[PDB]
């Protein structure tokens, strides 16, 4: 794992000047095309797109798990869900499975740990059935999240090999919203209150015990901020080591990953601690109607593309934003030129 | 045209509940998919799509025509472009060709107004060759103003029974955004400072003489904020006149459109006062990078799904946002229901 790290290759600079400078003399005002013109070159510059901005076969993987921290009423939703949508995914009657079709996009549906009997169709790299309560310890023990790391950044970098040149990252798992405010509130330094959300449809007289269950989890963990792997063992979970795992290993691969909401920035956050290599390659999509969206969105420096008020998750929001990267692409290669 | 506005259809509420309690029993969290929800019903309400959100053929529809205020140096693109752009448009190398191609849209070029000899490819609607310099008169008599706004809403819903279903407006046409920054004054009583913007690449320099050229086009014509018709033909120009009339004409059909930029949001403070009716069927797409657009979305209670920096204008906007209705109307009728 260090090796993969190690190995992030860093953007190619003289293809982004090539870039650029191709991009100014299209049959336009400079400039005139604001964040599509910043995503081609941003795009030219990462080393598996072979010099230039371009799309060819797009993935959305789908991490499911399910989460200790269930039993400690933070979530509405039966636990049975998870195993329940994931096998939906399966059917392609999902959000995240319409909206990827639309996108002529393939959804890899990863069970890193749902707390049930292995589904038939979904990839199998379950870590246990369900990860620790963190309320009252770690999520896991540090081995466990680095080997799902390795595991997973292998499995991204290997559908590169099929051809696949853009990935977006989604997650399934009730009560995510818990361990995801936490890890949040610790690479920010927020107060847990600030980034506690209603996640899916949670009763506004039951957000206080949230709020609650968080800063246990933070204080009995006592998670270090400065090791990425330190906090997602912590006060983490298996999904949101799975969204981390994608995002090294597109960057290893030298490929852009499209990120999602809420779950996905809090997955962001550790990947850039644990290498500040891996945020050339990470692309926004839309803005999160979850409360501490704007706070996460913040430390990383981020500027979604999208505002649909959006909180489904799966990675809707990803598989929504694929044809914006295509729009740069196509718009740099077929654009005329203002010298003819 | 007074038969035009009296005809244009109410939201159908019936289609709008039966879309509402279809969407709440999809197999996800009640209002998880949130703008995209109430898309759909938006949707669902208009006459045009049979009670059902779904979108057949698109069309994109570009008004272009010149200015006498370019005269007053308020623009560095030099005239010609606008004839330019035009013939390029027929070739499909502009901004908002290669974004509508990747849409699955067509592109109709229209000329309402160019200074410069027919060009072949074209759809002729031309009032003249330049609307008149609004700093010291009237762009247009109302009834030319009135000719244009039937013509085009009649050609538009024309394309209707043609089998297109929503429509995206844009525009070209050089030193435009200074009649369109003129219109956001007169409707919204902001100051002139506070909408007019660099347009295309205005040095910081020039924007004073262009708040100036505002200032005096409004304080000679006189136009009277509550007369839609009266502002678009004092301060307005025939590429402005024209995307107001796909707005009128799609809502006399009971179809959507979608917005582009700032341009196209001062023609819809135009439209909306003509015929409040039509507000039901206007769809935001982008927040533009104008000056003036906060103010101008604000006055129109829209909130924009992409936030992309662009002020390319040409309807790229609006082609950039087709496959976002699209996805709103494959989430309705793919997804499985929590029943099953």
Redesign the interface.
């Known amino acids: 794992l260090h090796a993969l790290l190690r190995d992030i290759p860093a953007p190619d600079a003289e293809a982004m000047a090539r870039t650029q400078q191709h991009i100014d003399g299209?049959?336009?005002?400079?400039?005139?095309?604001?964040?599509?013109e910043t995503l081609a070159v941003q795009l030219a510059g990462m080393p598996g797109l072979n010099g230039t901005p371009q799309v060819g076969e797009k993935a959305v993987l789908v991490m499911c798990a399910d989460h200790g921290v269930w039993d400690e009423g933070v979530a509405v939703?039966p636990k049975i869900v998870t195993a329940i949508?994931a096998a939906?995914m399966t059917?392609?009657?999902?959000?995240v499975?319409?909206?990827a079709?639309?996108?002529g996009a393939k959804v890899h549906v990863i069970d890193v740990g749902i707390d049930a009997e292995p589904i038939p169709g979904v990839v199998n790299m379950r870590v246990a059935r369900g990860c620790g309560n963190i309320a009252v310890g770690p999520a896991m023990s540090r081995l466990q999240a680095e080997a799902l790391l390795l595991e997973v950044s292998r499995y991204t970098c290997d559908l590169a090999q099929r051809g696949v040149t853009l990935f977006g990252v989604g997650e399934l798992g009730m009560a995510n919203t818990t361990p995801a405010a936490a890890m949040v509130s610790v690479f920010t330094g927020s107060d847990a209150k600030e980034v506690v959300g209603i996640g899916?449809?949670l009763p506004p007289s039951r957000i206080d015990n949230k709020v609650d269950v968080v800063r246990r989890a933070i204080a009995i963990n006592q998670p270090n901020p400065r090791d990425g792997i330190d906090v997602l063992s912590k006060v983490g979970g298996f999904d949101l080591v799975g969204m981390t795992g994608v995002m090294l290993g597109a960057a290893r691969c030298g490929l852009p990953v499209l990120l999602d909401g809420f779950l996905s920035y809090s997955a962001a956050l550790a990947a850039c601690q644990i290498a500040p290599a891996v945020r050339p390659y990470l692309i926004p999509s839309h803005?999160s109607?979850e409360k501490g969206a704007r706070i996460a969105l913040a430390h990383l420096s981020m500027?979604?593309?999208?505002?649909?008020?959006?909180?489904?998750?799966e990675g809707?929001g990803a598989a929504?934003a694929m044809?914006?990267v295509?729009?740069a692409c196509?718009?740099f290669h077929?654009?005329?030129e203002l010298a003819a």
Chains 1, 2 share one sequence.
Do not use: D, W
Request: hydrophobic content about 45%; glycine content about 12%.
């Open positions: 299209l049959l336009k005002p400079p400039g005139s095309l604001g964040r599509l939703s949508q939906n059917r392609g009657t999902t959000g499975c319409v909206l079709a639309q996108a899916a449809n803005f109607a500027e979604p593309y999208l505002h649909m008020a959006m909180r489904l998750g809707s929504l044809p914006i295509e729009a196509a718009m077929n654009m005329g």
